[PDB]
């Protein structure tokens, strides 16, 4: 999946070349970013449950119809709420994976690829998940490089959804 190190190696291999100073600079950028990414993943992991619950409630607040219309795709009952919380937890966990990996590769491999026809087949509105990601952006409480990288992943997911 898409990370600076693996793509540097794949691009070099497709060109039949050794790793040169370009790939070394790529690794240096990965090292510069990696500690902030790791501490962002730790901060999101520790506050994961609160973030997921608050994001689900924010989605319910901005889309109240999801809480009282009956149907498989809605969260009116406990089964729908469990599915919704599980989906938002999926989003948050994959975002932490991206922060660990240093690229959107975890999001692409695990969530982004094929998300649209899933959302279509099960009649799941992407605006719900966009609102969940906006809550995660506004409530993760990160700063500096950790915030910047994490927000890049969150709004990468938002852009893919919208």
């Amino acid at each position: 999946m898409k990370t600076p190190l693996t793509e540097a190696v794949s691009t070099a291999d497709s060109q039949g070349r050794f790793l040169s100073s370009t790939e070394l600079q790529i690794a240096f950028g990965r090292l510069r970013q990696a500690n902030a990414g790791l501490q962002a993943a730790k901060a999101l992991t520790d506050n994961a449950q609160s973030l997921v619950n608050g994001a689900a409630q924010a989605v319910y607040n901005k889309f109240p119809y999801t809480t009282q219309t009956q149907g498989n795709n809605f969260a009116a009952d406990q089964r729908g709420k469990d599915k919704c919380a599980r989906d938002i937890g999926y989003y948050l966990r994959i975002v932490t994976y991206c922060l660990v990996a240093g690229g959107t590769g975890p999001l692409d491999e695990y969530l982004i690829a094929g998300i649209d026809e899933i959302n279509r087949t099960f009649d799941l509105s992407p605006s719900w998940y966009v609102e969940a990601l906006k809550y995660i952006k506004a409530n993760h409480g990160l700063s500096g490089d950790a915030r910047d990288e994490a927000n890049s992943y969150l709004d990468y997911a938002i852009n893919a959804l919208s």
């Binding site: 890049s152 709004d155 990468y156 938002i158 852009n159 919208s162």
Partner: protein, 172 residues
């Protein structure tokens, strides 16, 4: 394509000379500006869908003839192609901002675009208007002072505006 370093490298190799001290110092000021360049690129990328969709909505509110039946933005296929074109132009503008050179925007995006749009009957003037709307949204997103280390970003904003106007001029 070239970036900011390879442009002067290619010019120097054609002249057959070592980069002068002045050119090296200019490339050092570019290195100093590199952090703000990365921030601009990141800010435009993070709001790309919003920029494209809002600019398209504005471009169809005024100039409604595009979305009327028989218009060039009518039918889902043509509407999707128009949205994709705006996204492509924005993406290549971000590429040009990232590299610091407009060569990627010319060679890969704007080359043959006017002849393309003419051969399809696409109203290139309307595309230029949409590019201006994307430009204004992108510039006010880049110049957003909250959530970022304060600093003067006038030079990078001028460069981004130049890339956007260059795309608009190419399509017009």
């Amino acid at each position: 394509m070239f970036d900011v370093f390879t442009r002067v490298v290619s010019q120097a190799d054609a002249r057959g000379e070592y980069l002068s001290g002045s050119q090296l110092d200019a490339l050092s000021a570019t290195v100093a500006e590199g952090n703000k360049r990365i921030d601009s690129v990141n800010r435009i990328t993070g709001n790309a869908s919003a920029i494209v969709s809002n600019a398209a909505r504005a471009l169809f509110a005024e100039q409604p003839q595009l979305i009327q039946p028989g218009g060039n933005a009518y039918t889902s296929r043509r509407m999707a192609a128009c949205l994709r074109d705006m996204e492509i132009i924005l993406r290549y503008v971000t590429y040009a901002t990232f590299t610091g050179d407009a060569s990627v925007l010319e060679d890969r995006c704007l080359n043959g675009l006017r002849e393309t749009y003419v051969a399809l009957g696409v109203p290139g003037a309307s595309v230029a208007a949409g590019v201006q709307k994307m430009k204004e949204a992108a510039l006010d997103i880049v110049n957003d002072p909250n959530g970022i280390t304060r600093g003067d970003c006038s030079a990078i904003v001028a460069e981004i505006a130049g890339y956007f106007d260059r795309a608009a001029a190419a399509v017009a």
